[PDB]
């Protein structure tokens, strides 16, 4: 089965550089083209680049005309986006995706094969701010009880929350993090359960913050 | 420079028909199979129709039997794919591939048996 796995995102100062990877598997890498499409936070899709390694065709959107270079390594089935001279406007989730090798040749009023498989995205954030890991305080429980976890003052995005290391899927709301006036991010994650269970059921929330290599596990008990 | 060139694709209503042509260069009697493959978004490139050059025997994928016809013209080194009764599931880029090393006929419809390929001609079958 085919998959496109991405790596190399993160935070970088303005003007700095960074190189993303798109590691392909499950198909002959030569018979296809690889595209990079990015998404600024809460904005649309921007196509940006593609390569077909076996004919070393490359093309570039105007908005990243001279700063970005796409390349590929058929030996290891990987495409690269080398980005230089990074501005804040380049902050986005960066997706890679597969098309036909000769898509430009094929394009017409009646044909467009689109892009069929996509990678998961890797977030690159461009700022001067520095990496800070979150603090985690409980939202302790009071018919049905509601408890949670506050994830305060971290940078950069993202953070992932789970409950009972994935064993508690149902009734979970993890909210979009919000940017506070301190320039750090804050979000909350909450669960509802039977109030009939707080006496017996222990609830841990599992907060991962890969950009700072930190994961906090916190049970939430009822205040007395 | 040995190379292949498809042509003849377009858009077609279901039930309609279309005829693709592939033209080879170099010297053409060394080839021993000409075949048509097709590739659709998210799906593997699949053998549709192979032609053994030196006896004219043809081999068809079960999904195109009786609707499609692969034929030749040594006078021109042009192979053709008459496609009849087209249906939307035939929508794909259609490629022409050639080999000059002999492979046993059970492998005639296999992608791996073919050294070189055209860039393809697109076919869209849609209401």
């Amino acid at each position: 089965e085919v998959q496109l796995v991405e790596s190399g995102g993160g935070l970088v100062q303005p003007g700095g550089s960074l190189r993303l990877s798109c590691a392909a598997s499950g198909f002959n890498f030569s018979y296809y083209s690889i595209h990079w499409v990015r998404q600024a936070p809460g904005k649309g899709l921007e196509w940006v680049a593609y390569i077909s390694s076996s004919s070393s065709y490359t093309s570039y959107a105007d908005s990243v005309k001279g700063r970005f270079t796409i390349s590929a390594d058929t030996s290891k089935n990987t495409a690269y986006l080398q980005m230089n001279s990074l501005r804040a406007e380049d902050t986005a989730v960066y997706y890679c995706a597969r098309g036909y090798q000769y898509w430009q040749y094929h394009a017409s009023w009646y044909w467009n094969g689109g892009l069929d498989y996509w990678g998961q995205g890797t977030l690159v954030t461009v700022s001067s701010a520095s990496t800070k890991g979150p603090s985690v305080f409980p939202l302790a429980p009071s018919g049905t009880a509601a408890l949670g976890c506050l994830v305060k003052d971290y940078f950069p995005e993202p953070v992932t929350v789970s409950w009972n290391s994935g064993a508690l899927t149902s009734g979970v709301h993890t909210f979009p993090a919000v940017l506070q006036s301190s320039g750090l991010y804050s979000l909350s994650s909450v669960v509802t359960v039977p109030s009939s269970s707080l006496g017996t059921q222990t609830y841990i929330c599992n907060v991962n913050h890969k950009p700072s290599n930190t994961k906090v596990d916190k049970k939430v008990e009822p205040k007395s | 420079q040995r190379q292949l060139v498809e042509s003849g694709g377009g858009l077609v209503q279901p039930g309609g028909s279309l005829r693709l042509s592939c033209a080879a260069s170099g010297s053409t009697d060394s080839i021993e199979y000409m075949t048509w493959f097709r590739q659709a978004p998210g799906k593997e490139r699949e053998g549709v129709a192979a032609l053994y050059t030196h006896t004219g025997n043809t081999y068809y994928a079960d999904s195109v039997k009786g609707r499609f016809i692969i034929s030749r013209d040594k006078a021109k080194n042009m192979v053709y794919l008459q496609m009849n009764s087209l249906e939307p599931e035939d929508t794909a880029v259609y490629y022409c591939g050639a080999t000059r090393k002999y492979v046993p006929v059970r492998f005639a419809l296999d992608q791996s048996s073919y050294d070189y390929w055209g860039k393809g001609t697109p076919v869209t079958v849609s209401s």
């Binding site: 899709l45 069929d116 804050s186 509802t192 | -």
Partner: protein, 208 residues
Amino acid sequence: MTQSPSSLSASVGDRVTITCRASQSVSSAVAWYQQKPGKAPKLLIYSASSLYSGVPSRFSGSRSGTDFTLTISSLQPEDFATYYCQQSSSSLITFGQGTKVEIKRTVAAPSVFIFPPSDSQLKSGTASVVCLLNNFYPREAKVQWKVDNALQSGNSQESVTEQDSKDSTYSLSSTLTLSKADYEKHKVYACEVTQGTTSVTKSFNRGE
């Protein structure tokens, strides 16, 4: 490329139609993709009208004059998403602005929860009070904080989840941020949620 319904709200079972106009004058067949909030977008229709493999039959595309349309014949709750059309000019691929698709449904009131600031957060000088609005519709709602019945301003922030995949309701949290100084100078902490013709207040007393 201008897609015309920039945003859109419709009920389950409805038939929905988004339009996409070619930008160039050399027409280019359109692909359409579905994207759920912060996930990789998924292909739906290619070559203007070809249904991508695996995509349910309720999706379809075609041309309308010199433009293209996408149609969901029977809108389903999992279908809330942003929908993008896609073109090729000449070695350039461009996407359209996107069309956001919201499910419409019957009114639902939230279950309101208020959470005091934790003891370990207070030890560090700041108090976060959080108000939770669970499983409501529609998403518009004035949530308001009160401290000894004094309305607050400029110290709150909200964020809502996206629609639940099976029942189409939102959830909201509002965090009131105070200094441990000011939190312990006051007693009654309340958050009020007004939806049309009702306001519901949940509160706690710092000496619980």
